[PDB]
Amino acid sequence: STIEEQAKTFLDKFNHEAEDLFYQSSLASWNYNTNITEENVQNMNNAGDKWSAFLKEQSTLAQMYPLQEIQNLTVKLQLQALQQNGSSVLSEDKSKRLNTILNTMSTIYSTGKVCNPDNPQECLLLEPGLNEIMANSLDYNERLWAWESWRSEVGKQLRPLYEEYVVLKNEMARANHYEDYGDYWRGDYEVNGVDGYDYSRGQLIEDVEHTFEEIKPLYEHLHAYVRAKLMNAYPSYISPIGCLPAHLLGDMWGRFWTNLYSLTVPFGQKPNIDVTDAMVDQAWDAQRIFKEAEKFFVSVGLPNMTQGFWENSMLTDPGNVQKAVCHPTAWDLGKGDFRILMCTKVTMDDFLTAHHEMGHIQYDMAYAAQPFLLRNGANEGFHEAVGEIMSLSAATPKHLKSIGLLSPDFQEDNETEINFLLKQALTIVGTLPFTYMLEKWRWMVFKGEIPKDQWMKKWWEMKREIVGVVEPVPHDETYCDPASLFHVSNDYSFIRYYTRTLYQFQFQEALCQAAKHEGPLHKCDISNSTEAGQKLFNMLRLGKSEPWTLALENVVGAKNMNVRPLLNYFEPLFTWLKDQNKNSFVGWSTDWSPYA
Amino acid sequence: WNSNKLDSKHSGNYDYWYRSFRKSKLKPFERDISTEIYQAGNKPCKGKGPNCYFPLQSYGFRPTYGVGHQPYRVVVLSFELLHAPATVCGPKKSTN
Ligand SMILES: *[C@@H]1O[C@H](CO)[C@@H](O[C@@H]2O[C@H](CO)[C@@H](O[C@@H]3O[C@H](CO)[C@@H](O)[C@H](O)[C@@H]3O)[C@H](O)[C@H]2NC(C)=O)[C@H](O)[C@H]1NC(C)=O
Ligand SMILES: *[C@@H]1O[C@H](CO)[C@@H](O[C@@H]2O[C@H](CO)[C@@H](O[C@@H]3O[C@H](CO)[C@@H](O)[C@H](O)[C@@H]3O)[C@H](O)[C@H]2NC(C)=O)[C@H](O)[C@H]1NC(C)=O
Ligand SMILES: *[C@@H]1O[C@H](CO)[C@@H](O[C@@H]2O[C@H](CO)[C@@H](O)[C@H](O)[C@H]2NC(C)=O)[C@H](O)[C@H]1NC(C)=O
Ligand SMILES: *[C@@H]1O[C@H](CO)[C@@H](O[C@@H]2O[C@H](CO)[C@@H](O)[C@H](O)[C@H]2NC(C)=O)[C@H](O)[C@H]1NC(C)=O
Ligand SMILES: *[C@@H]1O[C@H](CO)[C@@H](O)[C@H](O)[C@H]1NC(C)=O
Ligand SMILES: *[C@@H]1O[C@H](CO)[C@@H](O)[C@H](O)[C@H]1NC(C)=O
Ligand SMILES: [Zn+2]
C-alpha cells in the first residue's frame, strides 16, 4: 500500500511508545541523581536496559521503507534519524573490543593519581591535587614538575589503547558508508534537500578557516599585552620575543586564561562590581533569586514557569541527611515536567547561573509541540548560546542599578569598563585558538595526513602557529599529550564551542539593535523589548523541524556564520590595546627554547 | 474538570485506552468496540507483530505530569431542546 502511509503509521506507533519509555528513564535518572543508594543504581541500570532494548528493537522495524520514495520533507528527518545503524554494523567481537577499550580508557582517566618522589606515603589525585597546584600557586619549579609528570605517566600508558580505538572507529565509519570518523562528526551540521539552503559536510572546514583568519590581529595584540604584563611575575623565565610556555597559564591544558585577572589588571586601584552586601542586607534566599529571574524573563513577553516547577525542583542542598552531586542542571523529563537542580548560596556567580539555567528551561519549553525525534536544538551550538545571551544581558551595571539592588545615585564611570572588558576577554577570546588547533589536529589524525612516527613534529608546530605556546621540555614518541583532556579520553566532539562563541555575539547584536539601544554594545540590556522577544521566539519554537540556516535567518537575518559582532563587542578594548603597546615587540617567534 | 486525585497512580493508571488507527472515518454519535487486528498492507493479516496493529493504545497517567497530560473528565450533556413528551417540566418558583 502507499508506502508513505505505512511509514507514517510506524512513526505514529513509535512516538507513543517512546514517550512513556523515555519518561520512565528520565524519572529514574532524576531520583538517582538526588539520592545515593545501591538499589537505585540497580533500578537505573534496569531502566536504561529497557530503554536501550526498546530503541534497538524499534530500529529494526524501520528498515522496510527505502528513503528515496518520500516526498514530505518532515517525516524524512525522523526516518533518517531512526534508520541509522547504531552499532549493528560491526561484528560481535568488534563490539566487545570497542566497549572494552572505551570502558578501559574511561576508567584509566578516572582513577589517575600521582605520588611525589621519595615520599611513598605522599600521593595526590588529579582533580584533588593538581588542579589546586595549577590554579592558585605562584611557584615555578613545582608547576614544571607536575606538568612533566602527569603527561609522562598518562600519555605513555594511554597511547597504545588510543591507536586501536582510532583503528576500530575508522573501521566502523567506513562500514557506515562515510569517509572517516571526522566526517561522522562533521555530519551533524549537514543539511541536504531544500534548494537554496544546502550545506555540505565539507563546507564547515572552509567556513571555520575563513572565519578564524579574521580575529588573529586582535589575538595578536592581546597576546602581546599578556606577554608584556607577565614580565612582572616571571622576570627571569619569559623570553623577550618568544612564545609563552604552556606551564605558566593557570590550567593543566590551557583552555582558559581566567586565572590571570589579578595579574594583568589595567587599573587595579578600583575594585570590580560585586553586589553581595545589598543581597545580605535584605536577607536573600534562593526563592528571591529565582523569582527575579522569572520577572526578567517575563519582562520581554515570554511565558512564566509552570506551577509544578516551584514544587518539584530543589533549590538548596538538604544537608547531611541526603547526598547529591552539586552541579547545575535543567532537566527535561517530558510531558510537562521541567525541574532545576542546583545547590544555591548567595553569590553573584550563582545569580548568573540561575539565569543561564532558566533560559535553558525556556528553550526546552519552547519546542514542546514538535514530535519526539525533533525535540532538540537546531544544532549542537544553539543551546548554551541562548543560555548565555541572557547572562550577558543581566550582569551589566545599568540593569543592576535599575532593579533597586544598587544605589540610585550610583555613578558609572569609564574606568571600570576596561576592567570588565578585559575580564570578559580573558575567558572568551583567549580560548578560540585552543579549540581550533585541537579540532584541526584531531581531523588531521582521523584523515591520516600525519604519520604515526611524526605526530609531535606537527603537533608542536601547530601550537606555535595557532596558540603561540611552546613546550618547556623536549618530548619523544612515548608521550601522548592530547589524550589527557577530558573530552579526548572520552568520545566527545570539540567544535561546538567555536560555533557557540560566534553565535552568541551575533544574537546579542541583533537583539540590541532591534531593542533600540544607544551606545556601544557592552552597555546593552535586552530588557523591556517585545521587539527582541518575538524575534527570538520565532527561532525558539521551531525546534529541529526546519534547517538551522532558516532558523538563524529569522533572528540574525543572514544564513551563514558571521564574525563581525565578536570584534564589535571589543572595540574600546581594541583601541586601548592599540594605544598601549606602541613601544613593544609585535608577534611571536619560534627561536627561543628554554632547553636551548 | 481536573481529576488527578482519583485517576492516577505511581506505577500508572493503565486503565484508559484510546483508538489511534483506522482505515475509515466516523459518523456523528457512533460507538465502536471492534478489537479486530488492523491491516496496513496488502498481505493477509495474522495477529500482532509485523505491520498489523492492535487498534487500541493506552494512556500513562502519573501524579507528577504537567497540566496538559493530566486527566479532565468530560461529560457531554447533549440535551437537544426537542424531547417533546415529558419535556417542559419547569422548576416553577412559587411564592407565598
Ligand atoms: C508532511 O507531512 C505532514 C504529516 O502528514 C503534513 O502535516 C499536516 O499539515 C497540514 C497542513 O499543511 C495539517 O492540516 C491542518 O490540520 C488541522 C488539525 O491539526 C486542521 O484543523 C486544518 O484544517 C488542517 O487540515 C495536518 O494536520 C498535518 N498533519 C499532521 C499529522 O501533522 C505536512 O503538511 C506535510 N508537508 C508538506 C510539505 O506537504
Ligand atoms: C505570569 O506572570 C505575571 C507576572 O508575575 C502574572 O501576572 C499577574 O497578573 C494578575 C492579574 O493582573 C496580578 O494580580 C492582581 O491583579 C489585580 C487586577 O486584576 C491588581 O489590582 C492587583 O494589584 C494584582 O496585580 C498578579 O499580581 C500578577 N503577578 C503575579 C505575581 O501573579 C501572571 O499571572 C503569570 N501567569 C502565568 C500564566 O504564569
Ligand atoms: C546497516 O545498514 C545497511 C544499510 O545499507 C544495511 O545494509 C543491507 O545489507 C544487506 C546485506 O548486505 C542487504 O540485504 C540490504 O539490502 C542492505 N540494505 C540497504 C538499504 O542497502 C545493513 O544490513 C545494516 N546492518 C545491520 C542492521 O546489521
Ligand atoms: C525598563 O524596565 C524597568 C522595569 O522596572 C522600567 O521601570 C519602570 O518604569 C516606569 C516608567 O514610568 C516607572 O514609573 C517605574 O517606577 C519603573 N520601575 C522600576 C524602576 O522598578 C523602565 O522604565 C524600563 N525602561 C524604559 C526606558 O522604559
Ligand atoms: C531520598 O532519600 C531519603 C532518605 O534516604 C528519602 O527520605 C527520600 O524519600 C528519597 N527520595 C526519593 C525521591 O524517594
Ligand atoms: C575615560 O575618558 C577620558 C577622556 O579624556 C580618558 O582620558 C580616559 O583615559 C578614559 N578612561 C579611563 C580609564 O579613565
Ligand atoms: Zn548552560
DSSP A128-194: TBHHHHHHS---SHHHHHHHHHHHHHHHHHHHHHHHHHHHHHHHHHHHTT-S-HHHHHHGGG-B-SS
Ligand 5 pocket mutation, candidates A32, A35, A43, criterion most atoms within 8 A of CB: A35
Q: Which residues contact A223 (CB under 8 A, 6 or more apart)?
A: A244, A468, A588
Residue whose C-alpha cell is 597559564: A249
Rounded Cα gap, residues A125 and A131, in angstroms: 9
Evaluate whether A4 touches A69 at the Cβ level (below 8 Å).
Answer: yes
Q: A35-40: long-range contacts at Cβ-Cβ below 8 A with a sequence spacing of 24 or more?
A: A35/A322, A35/A323, A35/A324, A36/A322, A36/A323, A36/A324
Axis-axis angle for helices A286-298, A348-366 (nearest 10): 50
Rounded Cα gap, residues A534 and A302, in angstroms: 9
C-alpha separations of A435 from A16, A501, B23 in Å: 40, 11, 55
Residue whose C-alpha cell is 500508572: B12
Ligand 5 mean position, distance from CA A178 (Å) = 47
Q: Which residues contact B91 (CB under 8 A, 6 or more apart)?
A: none
Nearest-by-Cβ selection for A335 from B21, B41, B65? B65
Residue A46's CB is within 10 A of a number of other CB atoms, namely 11
Q: Is A113 helix (H, G, I), strand (E, B) or coil?
A: strand
Per-residue burial over A195-209, b = 16 or more CB atoms within 10 Å of its CB, e = otherwise? eeeebebeebeeebe
C-alpha separations of A314 from A279, A293, A295, A297, A326 in Å: 21, 16, 20, 20, 11
Q: What is the DSSP letter of A297?
A: H
Evaluate whether A178 touches A446 at the Cβ level (below 8 Å).
Answer: no
Alpha-helical (H) ranges within A448-514 are: 455-462, 486-489, 496-514
Rounded Cα gap, residues A454 and A342, in angstroms: 46
Query: What are φ and ψ of residue A441, in 5° steps?
Result: -60, -45
Beta bridge partners of B2: B72
Give the gap in angstroms from C-alpha B10 to the nearest C-alpha of chain A: 11
Rounded Cα gap, residues A571 and B57, in angstroms: 60
The residue type of A530 is: T
Residue A343's CB is within 10 A of a number of other CB atoms, namely 16
Rounded Cα gap, residues A62 and B85, in angstroms: 59
Chain mean position to CA A316: 25
Q: Which of A373, A332, A368 is nearest to A18 (CA)?
A: A373
The residue type of A441 is: W
Alpha-helical (H) ranges within A272-347 are: 276-281, 286-298, 309-312
Chain mean position to CA B53: 19
Evaluate whether A82 touches A59 at the Cβ level (below 8 Å).
Answer: yes
**Which residue range forms the structural domain that includes residue A242?**
1-596
Q: Is A476 helix (H, G, I), strand (E, B) or coil?
A: coil
Q: Which of A367, A366, A373 is nearest to A16 (CA)?
A: A373
Does any CB of chain A come closer than 8 Å to the CB of residue B53?
A: yes
A445: its cell numbers? 589524525
Binary contact (B68, A336; C-beta < 8 A): yes
Q: Could you write out the DSSP letters of every residue in A212-250?
A: HHHHHHHHHHHHHHHHHHGGGT-TTTS-SSSPEEGGGSS
Rounded Cα gap, residues A90 and A524, in angstroms: 53
The residue type of B73 is: R
**Residue A532: enclosing H or E segment and its boundaries?**
helix A531-540
Q: What is the total count of domains within chain A? A: 1
Evaluate whether A72 touches A13 at the Cβ level (below 8 Å).
Answer: no
Alpha-helical (H) ranges within A367-413 are: 382-394, 397-402
Decide: A272 in ligand 2 pocket, CB within 6 A: no
Query: What are φ and ψ of residue A387, in 5° steps?
Result: -60, -45
Rounded Cα gap, residues A146 and A244, in angstroms: 18
